């Protein structure tokens, strides 16, 4: 392999334990998609890494030690990550959760999720996609009892990977409650598992006897959790037509009567106007948009999140709760808070809680940017 000399800033990252190689720190770089050995300014060995374009990064540190990347290396990787997750395997209440999370498990560019009897792999750059044989071979040694597996490409977008086929749609269990999911359709699966603990809080009664508005609902997974926790009623608003059948499916799977659960297909900015005109108000408002969305407005979470808080407050009950969630990697905790304060203006409010990624979505403790989920619960 090539020995690569790194500048002082690149060095400073490595020695504090950051695995991510950012392009800013490697402006010199005319090499790609390969494993390298990194050296300092004065010819000292810094570690083995690989190079591949991934958003703002050029690669990842693999080990501070001199190592060979091959299948036996991945077997070790997956033995360690499996061993952190023993409790997931012993409790029967949750059958869908994350097995492997990039640098959270010491190998950036790969995630792996379990969904009942099937697994899902996601490739975040062209190098890991090039070596999938050895990644998949190692995983199937360490986890031989899955019936089949699927893949997402994150860098044709989705494909069956090995073993049996899954049904187009099927039920998994999370917190003792059923959700309808699907593995071979676009980039999403019917649920973001990383919100497992926010859903659990709702099932446990955090919205009992209360009315809930759920904005950018997707498949209404937050609404079904609230309903199972005794919520008096829920309203789930999403721009996309597909939200109807995909939401109905969780409610039928839990034998829930939908008399007081309404599904709405509508732009969230139109919903705010419609709700004000009809004097609708809700005890709890859950806000969880995508990080960037396209086309009667363009939505960017960095710039426009203040708008959602501002307009939600107009339709919140006295002593109401806002649950403000984002999965954007590019917005820090402090930037997210700043958007929220901008939305509140002068209005008194209290931050009751901050929730971030659960332990299966493991994080590199040295890199704060890895913890990309932020969920604030705010009391008005």
Ligand X SMILES: Nc1ncnc2c1ncn2[C@@H]1O[C@H](CSCC[C@H](N)C(=O)O)[C@@H](O)[C@H]1O
Residue ranges of the annotated binding site for S-adenosyl-L-homocysteine are 238, 242, 267-268
Give the x-and-dash track for 176-195 against ligand X (CB under 6 A): ----------------x---
C-alpha neighbours within 13 Å on the C-beta side of residue 59: 26
Does position 248 bind ligand X by CB under 6 A? no
Please tell me the distance from the alpha carbon of residue 68 to that of residue 218, in angstroms, as a whole number: 43
Tokens of 346: 């002068």
Q: Which is nearer to ligand X, 127 or 192 (CB)?
A: 192
Among 239, 248, 256, 329, binds ligand X (CB under 6 A): 239
Q: Which is nearer to ligand X, 194 or 360 (CB)?
A: 194
Does position 174 bind ligand X by CB under 6 A? no
Does position 290 bind ligand X by CB under 6 A? yes
Distance in Å, CB of 221 to ligand X, minimum: 5
Answer whether 267's CB lies under 8 Å from 296's CB.
yes
Does position 218 bind ligand X by CB under 6 A? yes
Task: Show contacts with ligand X in window 219-238 (CB under 6 A).
Answer: 219, 221-222, 238
Please tell me the distance from the alpha carbon of residue 139 to that of residue 281, in angstroms, as a whole number: 49
Chain centroid to CA 130: 24
Distance in Å, CB of 218 to ligand X, minimum: 4
User: What residues does 348 pair with on adjacent strands?
Assistant: none
Tokens of 265: 């297909």
Q: Which of 146, 73, 45, 61 is nearest to 109 (CA)?
A: 61
Tokens of 192: 């973001």
Task: Show contacts with ligand X in window 106-145 (CB under 6 A).
Answer: none
Sign of CA dihedral 98, 103, 105, 111: positive
Task: Show contacts with ligand X in window 74-103 (CB under 6 A).
Answer: none
Give the x-and-dash track for 257-276 against ligand X (CB under 6 A): ----------xxx-------
Q: Which of 307, 309, 311, 291 is nearest to 351 (CA)?
A: 309
Residue ranges at the known binding site? 238, 242, 267-268
Answer whether 123's CB lies under 8 Å from 93's CB.
no
Q: Which is nearer to ligand X, 117 or 267 (CB)?
A: 267
Among 103, 283, 288, 360, binds ligand X (CB under 6 A): 288
Tokens of 191: 């649920």
Distance in Å, CB of 260 to ligand X, minimum: 19
Tokens of 46: 């810094």
| Positions that interact with ligand X (CB under 6 A) | 192, 216, 218-219, 221-222, 238-240, 267-269, 288-290, 293, 299
């Amino acid at each position: 392999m090539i020995k690569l000399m790194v500048g002082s800033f690149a060095e400073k990252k490595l020695k504090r334990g950051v695995q991510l190689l950012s392009s800013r720190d490697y402006p010199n770089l005319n090499l790609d998609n390969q494993v390298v050995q990194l050296y300092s300014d004065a010819d000292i060995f810094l570690g083995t890494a690989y190079l591949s374009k991934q958003n703002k990064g050029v690669g990842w540190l693999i080990s501070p030690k001199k190592v060979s990347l091959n299948v036996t290396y991945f077997i070790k990787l997956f033995q360690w990550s499996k061993d952190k997750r023993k409790n997931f395997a012993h409790s029967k209440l949750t059958t869908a959760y994350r097995l492997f999370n990039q640098d959270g498990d010491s190998f950036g560019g790969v995630t792996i999720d379990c969904y009942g009897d099937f697994v899902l792999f996601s490739w975040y750059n062209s190098f890991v996609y090039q070596i999938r044989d050895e990644i998949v071979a190692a995983f199937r040694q360490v986890y031989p009892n899955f019936l089949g597996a699927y893949e997402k490409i994150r860098f044709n977008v989705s494909a069956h990977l090995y073993g049996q086929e899954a049904p187009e749609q099927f039920l998994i269990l999370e917190n003792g409650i059923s959700y309808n999911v699907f593995l071979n359709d676009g980039l999403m699966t019917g649920i973001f598992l990383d919100q497992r603990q926010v859903r659990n809080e709702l099932i446990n009664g955090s919205a009992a006897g209360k009315t809930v508005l759920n904005l950018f609902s997707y498949t209404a997974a937050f609404s079904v959790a609230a309903a199972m926790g005794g919520a008096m009623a829920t309203t789930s608003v999403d721009l996309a037509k597909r939200s109807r059948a995909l939401s109905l499916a969780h409610f039928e799977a839990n034998h829930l009567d939908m008399a007081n659960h309404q599904l709405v297909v509508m732009d969230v900015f139109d919903y705010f106007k419609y709700a004000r005109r009809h004097h609708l108000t809700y005890d709890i408002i859950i806000i969880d948009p995508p990080s960037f969305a396209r086309n009667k407005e363009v939505f960017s979470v960095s710039k426009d999140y203040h708008k959602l808080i501002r307009q939600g407050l107009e339709i919140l009950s006295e002593n109401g709760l806002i649950i403000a969630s984002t999965n954007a990697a590019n917005m820090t905790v402090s930037q997210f808070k700043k958007q929220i304060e901008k939305g509140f203006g002068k209005q008194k409010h209290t931050y009751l809680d901050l929730q971030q990624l659960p332990s299966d979505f493991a994080v590199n403790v040295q890199d704060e940017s890895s913890n990309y989920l932020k969920v604030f619960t705010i009391k008005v």
